Amino acid sequence: LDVLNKKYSLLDHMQAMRRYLLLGQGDFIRHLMDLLKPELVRPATTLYQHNLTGILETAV
Amino acid sequence: LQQSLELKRKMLRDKQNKKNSGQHLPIFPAWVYERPALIGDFALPIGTLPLASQESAVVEDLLYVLVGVDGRYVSAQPLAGRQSRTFLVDPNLDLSIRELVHRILPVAASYSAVTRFIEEKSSFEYGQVNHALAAAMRTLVKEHLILVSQLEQLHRQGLLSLQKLWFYIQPAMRTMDILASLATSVDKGECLGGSTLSLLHDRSFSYTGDSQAQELCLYLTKAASAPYFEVLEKWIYRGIIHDPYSEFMVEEHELYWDQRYTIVQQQIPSFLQKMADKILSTGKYLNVVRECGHDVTCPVAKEIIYTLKERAYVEQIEKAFNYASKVLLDFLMEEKELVAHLRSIKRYFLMDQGDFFVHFMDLAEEELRKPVEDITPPRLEALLELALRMSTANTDPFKDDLKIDLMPHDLITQLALSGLEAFSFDYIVKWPLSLIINRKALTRYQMLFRHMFYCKHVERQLCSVWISNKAQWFAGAFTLRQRMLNFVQNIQYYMMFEVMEPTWHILEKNLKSASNIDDVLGHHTGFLDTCLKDCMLTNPELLKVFSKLMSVCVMFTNCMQKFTQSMKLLVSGFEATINKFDKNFSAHLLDLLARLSIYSASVISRLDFNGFYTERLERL
Numbered sequence: 001l002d003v004l005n006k007k008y009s010l011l012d013h014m015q016a017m018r019r020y021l022l023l024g025q026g027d028f029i030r031h032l033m034d035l036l037k038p039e040l041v042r043p044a045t046t047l048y049q050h051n052l053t054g055i056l057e058t059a060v
Numbered sequence: 061l062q063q064s065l066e067l068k069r070k071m072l073r074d075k076q077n078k079k080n081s082g083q084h085l086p087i088f089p090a091w092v093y094e095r096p097a098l099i100g101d102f103a104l105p106i107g108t109l110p111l112a113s114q115e116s117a118v119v120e121d122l123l124y125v126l127v128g129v130d131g132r133y134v135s136a137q138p139l140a141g142r143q144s145r146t147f148l149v150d151p152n153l154d155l156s157i158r159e160l161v162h163r164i165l166p167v168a169a170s171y172s173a174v175t176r177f178i179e180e181k182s183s184f185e186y187g188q189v190n191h192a193l194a195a196a197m198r199t200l201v202k203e204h205l206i207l208v209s210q211l212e213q214l215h216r217q218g219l220l221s222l223q224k225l226w227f228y229i230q231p232a233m234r235t236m237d238i239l240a241s242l243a244t245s246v247d248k249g250e251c252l253g254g255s256t257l258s259l260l261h262d263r264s265f266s267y268t269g270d271s272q273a274q275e276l277c278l279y280l281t282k283a284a285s286a287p288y289f290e291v292l293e294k295w296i297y298r299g300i301i302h303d304p305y306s307e308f309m310v311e312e313h314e315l316y317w318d319q320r321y322t323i324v325q326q327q328i329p330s331f332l333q334k335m336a337d338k339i340l341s342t343g344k345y346l347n348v349v350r351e352c353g354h355d356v357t358c359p360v361a362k363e364i365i366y367t368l369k370e371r372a373y374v375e376q377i378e379k380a381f382n383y384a385s386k387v388l389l390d391f392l393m394e395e396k397e398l399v400a401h402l403r404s405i406k407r408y409f410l411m412d413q414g415d416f417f418v419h420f421m422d423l424a425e426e427e428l429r430k431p432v433e434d435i436t437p438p439r440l441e442a443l444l445e446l447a448l449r450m451s452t453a454n455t456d457p458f459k460d461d462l463k464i465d466l467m468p469h470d471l472i473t474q475l476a477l478s479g480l481e482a483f484s485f486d487y488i489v490k491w492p493l494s495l496i497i498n499r500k501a502l503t504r505y506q507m508l509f510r511h512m513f514y515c516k517h518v519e520r521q522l523c524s525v526w527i528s529n530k531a532q533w534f535a536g537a538f539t540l541r542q543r544m545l546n547f548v549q550n551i552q553y554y555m556m557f558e559v560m561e562p563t564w565h566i567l568e569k570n571l572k573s574a575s576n577i578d579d580v581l582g583h584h585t586g587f588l589d590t591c592l593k594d595c596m597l598t599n600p601e602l603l604k605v606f607s608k609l610m611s612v613c614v615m616f617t618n619c620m621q622k623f624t625q626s627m628k629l630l631v632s633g634f635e636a637t638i639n640k641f642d643k644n645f646s647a648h649l650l651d652l653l654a655r656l657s658i659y660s661a662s663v664i665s666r667l668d669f670n671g672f673y674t675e676r677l678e679r680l
Binding site: 046048050054 | 678
């Protein structure tokens with residue numbers, strides 16, 4: 001519990017987990033909901049992974 | 061037993077041919093096998109005597125059978141088919157003792173087939189480790205013969221009796237029965253070199269608890285490692301391998317990197333299996349520097365010695381991988397450099413230089429258009445030699461190496477046409493730096509250039525038509541030409557500044573942190589393989605969409621345009637061909653961007669810098 005702690009990181013990835021996946025950041029999930037609104041209000045089938053991936057980069 | 065000679069005949073026959081560099085390998089004179097006295101094995105009525113007289117007469121003869129000689133009463137019947145010599149207690153002997161002798165007589169049989177081991181595996185053919193297994197199992201036969209005598213000294217004074225002997229010979233029904241096991245197992249199957257050194261590191265763990273016997277197995281196997289470790293104290297430290305009888309794991313084929321030196325799996329001794337890979341490595345690295353001279357000497361040389369549970373026989377092998385493969389890597393890096401040569405490969409093969417390409421193309425253009433078999437090879441070797449002498453690419457020193465190859469195939473090879481699509485380059489390389497940039501590496505480098513050729517070839521023609529026109533009123537082809545310019549000037553920005561320039565930077569950093577030739581031949585295998593995959597070259601359909609777009613483009617640039625077939629220098633027929641070409645272009649252009657979306661971003665990401673042609677149409 002010192003190697004996994006530093007060489008690879010259990011503490012850093014378990015805490016940012018609070019922000020990015022669990023919505024802990026809040027600031028980021030507001031911006032994501034003001035850019036991804038139009039593309040999401042489209043019909044479902046038309047969308048493809050490359051489309052959704054593109055946006056994430058802008059907000060981060 | 062002649063059968064033995066045949067085994068001997070086969071061993072020698074196989075040995076000689078493998079290496080005829082050293083001739084007349086030692087062979088023992090024949091009288092040695094033929095005479096039977098070099099090896100150990102070869103009156104009063106007992107019935108009417110007093111019982112004690114029977115016990116003292118038996119104790120007298122038994123004391124003889126414990127050594128390899130017959131007895132007046134206890135005797136040996138001929139072995140015949142059964143290998144262990146069973147014995148024939150004289151008939152009508154006391155039935156009380158006839159049983160007790162059969163408890164002390166199992167020693168002389170576990171000794172009868174122990175000299176028959178040493179007086180056989182002494183032959184040079186049996187190997188240079190089967191040799192000491194059976195000459196450090198001889199010292200044990202000297203202690204045994206010392207004990208058998210001390211007991212006679214007691215017998216001389218009436219002080220030994222069958223029971224006293226029964227207590228006395230118990231220590232030697234084990235220390236000489238462990239020996240009658242290794243002997244009938246090293247002999248069982250067959251074993252030479254490392255295979256014997258593993259049967260004495262298996263029968264060592266099995267007897268890991270007795271202790272009375274464990275030390276004897278360790279004396280037998282700390283003595284059979286003595287010959288091999290001297291050989292592994294050479295291949296590990298200086299490249300020379302002696303291996304007179306094919307014993308060593310790393311054989312050397314006469315023939316290089318692929319087959320000159322090979323691990324032989326059966327001979328690998330069991331306790332080096334994990335470190336077997338490191339051994340081959342350290343030596344191969346030492347040999348390539350020892351044929352060109354330089355230095356092969358090792359600053360520290362130590363005597364690797366066997367042990368059980370305290371292994372330095374797994375450590376000194378590592379202070380050799382971390383010197384041998386660190387002197388070779390730095391020899392390459394400051395003598396016969398591959399850092400500088402790689403830059404003089406990038407300068408021409410990867411189309412980095414622009415001066416060499418613009419001066420050369422114009423100078424050779426007339427000849428380039430000609431069909432092959434009309435091409436002048438010496439005139440292409442003269443024109444190259446000058447185009448280079450005139451460029452800024454003259455300054456670099458390793459330039460002389462460039463030569464002109466003639467790939468008959470034109471990317472069609474991928475599994476009689478024009479000079480423009482039969483132009484290849486080969487950069488000669490010396491033997492020391494060849495190890496990294498081998499034939500395989502250059503061929504792929506060659507293919508990356510052949511594809512980059514068309515994109516360079518079309519760019520000069522579009523620019524050519526633009527100047528010829530700017531009779532000038534027509535503005536129909538002023539737009540189709542404009543669209544082609546964006547794709548073929550933006551493919552050359554994406555390919556050059558993302559697929560090649562950053563990835564080349566990732567190899568030139570990774571090479572500064574490399575450890576061994578195994579590591580380096582990897583990163584260069586990396587930039588070459590990974591960069592080729594990022595360009596459109598790697599596709600099952602080979603993105604033939606690129607192949608048919610460039611064919612139709614040339615159709616527009618010259619096959620149809622032909623500089624307006626010199627109309628400037630008609631019926632609107634060429635406006636219909638512009639239309640036919642424009643629709644073929646849109647279909648083909650769509651297929652690619654859709655293919656870029658379906659298989660694996662940036663070329664699409666910026667072509668539509670303002671949503672240009674965002675969706676002419678959507679598939680399904």
